[PDB]
Design a protein around this ligand. Structure first.
Ligand SMILES: [Mg+2]
Length: 141
């Protein structure tokens, strides 16, 4: 069992972690045979005995910067009082950071009626953040 994914080069220090701390975790996953980074393509290859093990290792390393578009009319539901809810969401989810971006009205490329929330984190952490977003946006009354 072998999987491969690309981690953008500016996120590489998150994937590897301070003195390899993060990649060390992915390596010590039982069942993982090997993890190799092809630095000229920023591609991790993870080799291992079962799929679950290789996926568990991918889980630590698969950093991304993904944009979620949040309806402007609902933005406050996700930010909270005392910017506290958005901080809890980042903290619970496990993401590294969210940037909420307000672009000048002249800036043409904008989904209409939307505020970009740009998360940096593992794919799984962003998935966690997304459920909490949707919960506060659409569900919670
Ligand atoms: Mg390089």
């Amino acid at each position: 069992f072998h999987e491969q994914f690309i981690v953008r080069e500016d996120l590489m220090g998150l994937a590897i972690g301070t003195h390899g701390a993060n990649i060390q975790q992915a390596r010590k996953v039982p069942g993982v045979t090997a993890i190799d980074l092809d630095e000229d393509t920023c591609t991790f290859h993870i080799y291992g005995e079962d799929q679950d093990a290789v996926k568990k290792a991918r889980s630590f390393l698969e950093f991304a910067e993904d944009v979620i578009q949040v309806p402007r009319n609902l933005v406050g539901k996700v930010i909270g009082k005392n910017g506290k809810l958005i901080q809890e969401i980042v903290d619970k989810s496990g993401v590294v950071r969210v940037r909420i971006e307000a672009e000048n009205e002249k800036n043409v490329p904008q989904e209409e009626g939307m505020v970009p929330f740009v998360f940096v984190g593992t794919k799984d952490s962003i998935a966690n953040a997304t459920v909490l977003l949707d919960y506060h946006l659409n569900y919670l009354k």
